[PDB]
Structure formats: structure tokens, C-alpha cells
Amino acid sequence: GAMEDPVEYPADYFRKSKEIPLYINTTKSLSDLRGYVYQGLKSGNVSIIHVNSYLYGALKDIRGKLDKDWSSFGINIGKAGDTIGIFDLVSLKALDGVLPDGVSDASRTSADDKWLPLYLLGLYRVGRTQMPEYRKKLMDGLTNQCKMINEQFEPLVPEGRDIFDVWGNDSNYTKIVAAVDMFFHMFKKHECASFRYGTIVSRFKDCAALATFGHLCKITGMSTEDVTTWILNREVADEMVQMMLPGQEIDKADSYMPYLIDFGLSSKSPYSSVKNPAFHFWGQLTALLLRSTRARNARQPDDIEYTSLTTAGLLYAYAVGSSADLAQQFCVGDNKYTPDDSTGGLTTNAPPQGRDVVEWLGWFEDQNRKPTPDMMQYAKRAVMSLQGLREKTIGKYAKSEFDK
């Protein structure tokens, strides 16, 4: 990415350092910090250092026993039948010297601590959201989640809301968010697995192109290999190699790689939609033409070959749409279907029966490399009836393109 954009890989971080430093400051009594956090949230202002220092002290449960080894990028977290805590994934402590805030002494050593850390970590998910109508949906889910731990829990934070949106910029807050999610990913049956309500969005954060690669594989019904053969643009291909560089543990479920942004392993993600704009445009457009309900809202990237990427997306979508490969799966014994009758269509004109990129490429030549009146129809019929489209979306682009 020449300047600013130089992609940083998860594996390259561990070449330089063998530990993730978590700067938890002051480290001074859970009872006092609980009073700081409880009253702080209720007051309308709470220091992030207190939230951090409380979150650490409340989550030091050395729970969850491994039945299989734990290792990622050369870091051996656990071996065989070891019992580890959520903070064995990180390192360090760095006292500084704190500052005053509103405190409740009425706060409980018992009643709080079983829902409060869940409430704080949940504010991470709510803060990232921007659309106010949808912010409430996660807030109400969070209200329920803590109400599931008794107390008839009623949201502590007033409608001020400014305070927890800035939390996502704290280097140490997000490291606990990543530690919690990674931990209860290994122990998904653990008692405190519910704490993953707000931390789930830290996993595969800023990896939209890998999500797009997955979306496209599901809508087409093809393998990762077969999808890759259907890439017809160079920039998409160049971006594909960038994504598929070996030794990054992108297929490992138990890995540090999903939290590369929140752990601070990578300043610039390789798998972000912004760093793969050609693949993201092509992938999401093709998927939308193949009846995706999510692709319509996808962000239309800037500085890409719109015209060329559209022709490759249309041909790919038209190949999947015209070749709904239907065959027998079950038979009442004997009565079986075996095809290959004729298989030779209308002279030079008939489109291929399979989904072979090469055959469709050869067919495209015969059509003088220009979208067929039927190809334009297919896309036109997929983009019409789309309503409530927003500016600079794949949906708006696609409808403006093919609906006239």
C-alpha cells in the first residue's frame, strides 16, 4: 500500500514481540473500584482507567480447563489439561496514579460483579453502532442480559451516551474485550460465556473482505477454490493474494488473528474492505445480483474500475443464475436420473450448462464480449423492486446501472 496503507500482518507482530502488554493501572481494591464504576456510570461520567482496573479485578477467574493444547503464532498459552484465566492471553501491569470520581459505598461485593462486567463490556458493542434506532435494539438486549442475572437490572448510564462511545479508542479496554471473547470462544459452555454479548464484535473486526469472500461462497454455493477461478480482473486477483498469504492462521478458530485490530497486532488490516476495494465491490455486486438481502447496503468503494468489475460480476452472476445445477439426491430404488442428453445447445449461441469459468469465457467471446440482451435482463430483473436504497451503496449503484 506504498504509504500509510502498508498492510501489517498478524504473524509479523509475533516476530518482534512474544507478549501482548495490558497496561492495567493503579490496581487498588475491587470494592473501591466497584463504587467508582457503579456511581460513575449512574452519574454520567466515569474514567476509563477505573473501568479497566475494575474489569481486570472482576474477571480474574482462573476458570475453564483445556482438554486440548492452546497455541497461536508460536505463543503457547496452555498445554494439555491446564487451567487458565482470561488474562493468560495477555501480560503486564503499569501503575500511574489515578484521579477522583463519584463513589457509592452502598455497592455490593455479591450483587454486583456477576452482571456489571457484562454491562461494561456490552457498552462496547452499543457504542460502535451509530444509527439511533438500532442502538436501542442492542441496549435492550443488554438490559435483558443483565436482567437475566437478577436484580431487575435497570440501565445505569443516562441518555448522555457520550461516555462509552469513546471507550473503543482506549488501547487497554479493547484488549480486555479481545481477551474475554477469545477466552469464552475456547470455553463456550462456561458459566460466564454470556459476557460475550458485547465482545463478539471484536472478533474478525475490520475483516470485511474475508466476510465478503464467505458471503459470496454461500450465495453461489461454490468452494473457495471455485470462486477464485471466477476472478476475471487483475486488481481483484492481486487483492486475493494479499488476503491469502500463508502463515496467518485465518482458518484457525482458536487463534489471535481475529482480534488483530483490538489486540494491536495490526495497524492496517490486510482483510479490511478498504484495503480490498476491488474484491469487495465485485464480490458484493455479484452476491446482490444473486438475491442477497444484505449486499444492498454494502459500501460502494472509491477509486476502482466500476465498469470493468461490473461486467465480470454480471457474467459470474449470470452463470450461477442460468445454471441452477439440479440433480437427484434420493430415489425410491432403481428409478434414477442420468443426464447428458444432447448437452449441445443452440449452435454457437447456447450458454454453457456447467459453471466452468473457461467455457463461459469462451462463450463470452462469441457474444463479442458484450453483455447479452438476456444478461442485461437478468440483472435488470434483480435490481428492480429494490426499495429504500441509500446513496453510495452497492444496491443504489446496481439499480441505477441495470434498471435503465
Add this chain to the structure above:
Amino acid sequence: GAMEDPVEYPADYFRKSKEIPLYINTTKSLSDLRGYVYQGLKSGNVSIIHVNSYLYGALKDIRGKLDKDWSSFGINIGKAGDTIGIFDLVSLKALDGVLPDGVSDASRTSADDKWLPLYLLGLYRVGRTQMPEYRKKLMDGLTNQCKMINEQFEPLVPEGRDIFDVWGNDSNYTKIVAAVDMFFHMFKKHECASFRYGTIVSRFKDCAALATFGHLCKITGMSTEDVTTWILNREVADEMVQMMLPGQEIDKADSYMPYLIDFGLSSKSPYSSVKNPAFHFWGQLTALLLRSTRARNARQPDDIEYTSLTTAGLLYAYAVGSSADLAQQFCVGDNKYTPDDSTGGLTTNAPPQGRDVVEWLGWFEDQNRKPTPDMMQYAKRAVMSLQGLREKTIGKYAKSEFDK
């Protein structure tokens, strides 16, 4: 499966435990627990601990004489003709720490006990609905069901109502619900069979794909066997095998099977629409094209091959729609009709007479594997006239796909 989502089967719970542990709360008299529940409901706050304890005390009617042996997953609930109670389907009792609440001692030791369990168990079904319009319909029916026992019954809990929604998240509450329903499914003629007003929704909870399979069989009028042959997609086939895994007692009327989720037998149901999304989409789409009044509100799944599944549903629905298979059922002596005359019609273009999947697969091949104008017209007539469809529903998809 693969990660977090791996399906858990009913039969596999009973391999590791022969009990379904119901942790019933600190023993503090029926009379006292009546006061907590009665006052706590009409006041606006009542502990689920007290709700569960009261439900145990009031529902201990050992009134059910077996007419046949009782067995599910190797567990012998009963034999020959012995008398059993609701809580013979579960086990155990666990104490913790009790909590103060508002009580009324004016409550009758006997009179309230006839309708209150029905009322508490009925709020389970009420708390499962989001739409306030239909949510009131269930509340009115619950009031009328309690008015049948006691003439002067008025709904206890105020308009707040967000109190009993959280009960469904309590492990022990749902176990009473599942135990109550399984009991009165056996003893249908029992005096307290009315208690199933609210507990019925525990039955086949998160087993939507089995209901989808049942729906498709009723709408097409084809056997489970014949429906399975009409599956033309590999993912749908994979899901069908997952649903039809042997020894799970899915055909057994009286089993622990239907109450998978509420009994804690499985955390991920193999019969859900979420885990069987291709079968769900295709099954519900085919049903809708065949005049299902319920299919138009079925949830549209994400990350599935809409294009392939739509073509498979259309060919299937078009086959059922074209082949009515009308035959004489009653004759008035001698005068009968034999369909032997005419077995073949016009061209490679005429659709098959019957509903044989292999015959239509052959016909489909000769039409270039592209839906014919008439095939597209059948679907258009089946979707236009559908009014007021929600977003991300099968009905919206089908109209948007076929209404042009």
C-alpha cells in the same frame, strides 16, 4: 456444525445422565409461597425463585394412572399401570439464598391454587411474542381460561408486563413447563389439562424445519418419502440427513424428544430453521407457490443458494400444480372410469402426467434447464394478489422474484 453451532441430539444427553435435574427452591410452605406469588404478580415484581417454588408445591398432583409402559431414551418413567405425578419426569431439589418480597395472607389456601398455576404457566406463551397486538390476544385467552375455573378472576400483573419475559431464560422454570406439558399430553382427559394453554409452545420448540417438512407434505399431499425424492439440492439433502438421524424418537408422540430445549437436552437443535436454512427456504417457498397462507410470513434465511433453491422449488411446485392426479373415488356400480386411454401427449414440450421426479428432471433437461414462460407464469399468478408482506420474509422474496 464445525464451530460453536454443532448440533446436539436428544439421545446423546441420556448417554451421560439418566436425570433431568430440576433445582427446586428453598422449602418455605405452600401457603407462604402463595402470598409471595399472588402479591408479587399484582404488585409488579416477583422472584422466579418464588414462582418456581410455588409451581412445584401447587402442581404436586400424583394423579395419572398409566395405561401403557412409559419409556424414552432408556428411561423408564413408568410401567404396567402405576400412578405418577408431573415431577416423575424430573428429579432433585436445590437450596441457595432466599429474598424478601411483598405478600398477602388473605389468599385462600385452596381457591387460588386451581387457577394460579395455569396463569403463571400461561405467561410463558405470552412472553414469547413481540407483537403487542397478538400478545394481547394470548393474554385475553389466558384471562378467559382462568375465568372458566374462577368466575371472578381479573388479570393480576399490571400493564408493565416486561416481568415474565425473563422467565423463559430460567432453566428451572422451563423444566416445569416441559414437565407439565409432557404429563398432560399423556393424560389428555385429566381435570388439569387446561394448564397446557401456555406450556404447549415448549413442545417442538426450535424444531421449525420438522414443521416445515410436515407443512410441505400436507400442502402437496405427498408422503415424506415422495417429498424427499423431490430434493434437487445437495445442501438441502445434507440437512435432511441431519434431521433424519436414527434413534432420536422424532416420530414418537410421547417422548422427551419434543422438549429438547426446555429440558436442557440440547443447546443447538438439529431440527431448527437456523440449522436447516436451505430446506427451510426451499420448503416454505414451494409451499407458498402451492397456496400456503402461512408461508408468506416465514423468515428468509441468510447465506444460502437462493437462485438454485428457487428453481428447484418452482419445478416442484409447478409439477404438483400441473399434476392434480384426479381419479374416481366412488362408483355407483359397473360405471367406472379407467385412465388407460391417453398416457402420452404433445412433443418434448408437454410436461409429464404424474409427479415422478425422474420424469420431470428429464423434461426439465429438454427445456434447456431454464424455466419456461408457462412455468414462470404459474409462479406469477401464485404471488401477485399477495398484499402486505414484511421484509426478509419468504412471501416478499417470492413476489419480488416472480411478479414481473
Add this chain to the structure above:
Amino acid sequence: GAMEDPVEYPADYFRKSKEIPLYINTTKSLSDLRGYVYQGLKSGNVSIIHVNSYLYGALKDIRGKLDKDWSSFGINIGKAGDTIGIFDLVSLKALDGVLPDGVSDASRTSADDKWLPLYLLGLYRVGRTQMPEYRKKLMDGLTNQCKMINEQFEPLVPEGRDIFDVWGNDSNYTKIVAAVDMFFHMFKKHECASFRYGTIVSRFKDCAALATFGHLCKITGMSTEDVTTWILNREVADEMVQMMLPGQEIDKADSYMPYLIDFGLSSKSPYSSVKNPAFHFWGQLTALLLRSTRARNARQPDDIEYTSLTTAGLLYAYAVGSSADLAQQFCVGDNKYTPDDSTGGLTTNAPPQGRDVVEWLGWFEDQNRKPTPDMMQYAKRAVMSLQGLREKTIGKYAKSEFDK
């Protein structure tokens, strides 16, 4: 040009002087100057001489160790492992007498000096936008940036604003802005790299033709050299030669050249859109026809050859549109696609298969040098669907030109 238009190249500046003079006036000490600027903002009137003097005193972090030698236009800023400051890029001072204003002594030495330089430098970007709807978005973003350095900062300057709008007209203020931006561009991973929030708009300031040149390359997917061959108007070519003059370090990222305006190196930028009006119009129009989301709002230049530039833009956009060069990028070893093409279509009237300007020019001559119906239809379809077009823009021009 000719009159006041004569362009000034950044290279020709350093032949006259070997230093960029920053007139930092008066030494009243950091503590006194902080009170002036802090209260001056709160009050709504502050002297720029104070703002400049404070910004100097706070930004003398002689941090940032150099990785390689830094030289631009023969000015050796640093060598190998030198430690340089922000004001090592410039030089000088010139003290005199100063004005009185409001002062707060409650302002702390270290506390204010972390977020305040960012707030002052950030107001450069804010005060240079006109439309109030977007000014608030930048203002709130600036507030969000200061809330990261924290202390729950609230905007000091009231709704009156305007006070910071005239700051960009002060030559010394712009020199600090350019020095901060050039510095932290080299030191990307510096603690105070967040200061680039407002200084970013100083980089490549008034160099919109080079931005237009870069935009056309990204949309077409063609190289700078290939885009250059597609220039068919001499005025555009004469403007291109003006831009591509040797010895200007325009491809050098670590250079003085991106801040020719703010450092005072140039009075007339050779890279401005007003100085390259034929290239700007033609380049943006071609971009718009190839589905650019940004080209629609590009200003329409005055006193240019509209008809010739439009026809050349159409021929270029039609060439890129018709010839989306699709080729197989990945394969399963053996099954590879090779275009035996035949490289010929419908006689003399079949458009060229590639993007060779020579091939398209010859085809255009055979079309009697008149845009074809398909050529005009391509442009019509591209411009229709454009909604909310502003007067005197390339977007609105293109719609009026082709939407008929």
C-alpha cells in the same frame, strides 16, 4: 500563463532561498500564552500572533528519530540517525510588541498542552469548509479527537466561529500547519500523529489536476502513461506537459512540494484545476461516464473548448466501457483459457477489441468522426439516474448534454 497566471514551480523557489522563514513573534513564555489562547477561544476573539506563538511553544517535541536521510530540493533536513523537530523543516523568529486580551490562570501547564495544539491546528480544516452541514461533522470529529487525548473537552469557541476562518490567510499559521503535516507524515507512528486531523488538507493543496490525473487512472484501470496516450486535445496536452515538468519531486512522498501553497513556495500552483481547466474538465467528464461517485460534483471550468473535450471524453469512456478486458486469473492446473479470439467482428463498424488509442482513432475516422448512436446511448444511460445535480458542475453539464 501570461499575466498574473505565470505558474511558480516549487523547485524554482529553492534556487532563490535555502530556508523557509517562519516568523514566530514575541517570547511571552508558554504559561502566559496558554491563558491568552484558552480564554480567547472561550470569549470568541483571539489574536493569531498569540495562537502562532503558543503553537510553537507547545510543539517543540524534538522527538522522532530518523530512519533514512531526508532531503528535498537539495535541502538536507537530516541524515541517517538524526533527531529532528517539527520546526527543523523551517527556520527563524522576529519578536516585537503585542496586544492584550482575556486570560485564564486556572489553565494547567501540561494538561492543556496535549489536546490544545490539535484543536488549534484542527480549526484550519474546519474554517475552510463553507457549507454548515459538513462543518459540524468536522467540528464534532475534532471534538471526538480531543476527547481521545481526553478530559471530556468541550468546544471552546462558541457558535460565532469565523475567528479561525481568517487564520488560513496568515502566512505563518499555514507554515506551522505544513510543518506539522510534513513532520508526522515521516513519523507515522508518533504519539502526536493524531494532530494530522486538521493539517491533512494542507498536503497537495490546490493540486487538483494531479488529483484529477490520479482519479482517472483508478477509474479506468489504466496507467499514467496509458492515460496520457488517450489525450486527443492539444490544450489538454499543453497542460499535461506543464504538470509533468522534471525536477519537481511530485512522486516524492517525503518532499516540500506537496505544500507549495502553505509553505509559500508558490504563488500560482502549476497543478491547480484552474490552471489545468481543459484536463480537469475532460478528465472528470470521462471519469463520470465511467461511474465515478465524486466526478458529478466537480466544478465546470470557464473559457474552454467544451465540444472538443466532450467528444474526446466520450470516445475514451466508450472505449473503456465497451472493452472491459476480462481474462482468467486463477485456474485448476491444466484447464486454462487462451483467447484464440479471431480478433475480428462486424466489418469496419465493429469497435476495437482493446484500448489502443490508435485503433480507436482509426475506427472513429471510419465513423466519419461523429459519435455513433451506441456511443450516445452509452453516455445517456450513464448520466440518467444522476439526481440532485448542482449548477455549474461536470455532473449537471453531462446530464444536459446526453440525457435526450
Add this chain to the structure above:
Amino acid sequence: TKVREYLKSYSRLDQAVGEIDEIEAQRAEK
């Protein structure tokens, strides 16, 4: 794709699935 078949071990399946859909019709909302 390629074909496989087995007669389901359940048999009483046809009666069962129809009953499951009866209960499913009862949880639908207006």
C-alpha cells in the same frame, strides 16, 4: 449430484411431522 437412498427408520414419520406443524401454526403471530 450423485444419488443415495434409505427408508427412514421412523415410519410413523408422516403422522409426526403433520402434528409438529399443527403446533407450529399455533405460535404464528398477527
Add this chain to the structure above:
Amino acid sequence: KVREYLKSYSRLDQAVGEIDEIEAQRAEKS
């Protein structure tokens, strides 16, 4: 033009499907 490679990722097909599931959860509407 260039040869396909597994690139050490054999559980890649399963992984990308899991990534899109989490991506669907972070989709804002209304």
C-alpha cells in the same frame, strides 16, 4: 494464468462462512 494453491488453509471454506455470520450481526438497520 497463475496456479491455485491451498496456502496452508485447509479449513478455509469453513472459516469464511463463520466470518460472515459475525459480520451479519454487526449490520445496522432502521
Add this chain to the structure above:
Amino acid sequence: TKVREYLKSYSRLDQAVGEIDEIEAQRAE
């Protein structure tokens, strides 16, 4: 022809002009 293409000093022009457009993209309303 007025003149033939000469790779004028700026060998890294292609990467450079795209970076200039990135900054110009942040100036739109």
C-alpha cells in the same frame, strides 16, 4: 504529434497520483 511519451523523472508517478486523489477525496462535502 506534438511530442512522444517520455517517462518524466517521476518513475513512481502511478503510486503518487493515487495518493493525491485519496487526500482530495477527504475534501468533498
